[PDB]
Amino acid sequence: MDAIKKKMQMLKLDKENALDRAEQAEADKKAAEDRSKQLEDELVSLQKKLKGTED
Amino acid sequence: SDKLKEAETRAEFAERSVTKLEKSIDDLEDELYAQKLKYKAISEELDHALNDMTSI
């Protein structure tokens, strides 16, 4: 009819916005966790270098 | 002669009446055509909404 189509369009705009936000948040999590794990690896290498210096 | 006049008058009235009835049935047939167009359009719009929603 008439109002039904507009209501469906609203329900679809919510769909697109929610899905896009979810995808963007997932990408953010991937990037942040990669950052953290690379920092942890750098910390490990520093520990090993400290060990060599102690030797 | 009198009977002929009477019969001719009744036949003329009958012709006029059938003309009126044929015009009335034409009008009502046209109205039914319009309502059939209405149902065709509303079913088409419902199908359009259905295909849009199923196809996003």
From Swiss-Prot, chain B:
<feature type="modified residue" description="Phosphoserine">
    <location>
        <position position="43"/>
    </location>
</feature>
<comment type="function">
    <text>Binds to actin filaments in muscle and non-muscle cells. Plays a central role, in association with the troponin complex, in the calcium dependent regulation of vertebrate striated muscle contraction. Smooth muscle contraction is regulated by interaction with caldesmon. In non-muscle cells is implicated in stabilizing cytoskeleton actin filaments.</text>
</comment>
<feature type="modified residue" description="Phosphotyrosine">
    <location>
        <position position="33"/>
    </location>
</feature>
<comment type="similarity">
    <text>Belongs to the tropomyosin family.</text>
</comment>
<comment type="subunit">
    <text>Homodimer. Heterodimer of an alpha (TPM1, TPM3 or TPM4) and a beta (TPM2) chain. Interacts with HRG (via the HRR domain); the interaction contributes to the antiangiogenic properties of the histidine/proline-rich region (HRR) of HRG. Interacts (via N-terminus) with LMOD2 (via N-terminus) and TMOD1 (via N-terminus).</text>
</comment>
<protein>
    <recommendedName>
        <fullName>Tropomyosin alpha-1 chain</fullName>
    </recommendedName>
</protein>
<feature type="modified residue" description="Phosphoserine">
    <location>
        <position position="55"/>
    </location>
</feature>
<feature type="modified residue" description="Phosphoserine">
    <location>
        <position position="24"/>
    </location>
</feature>
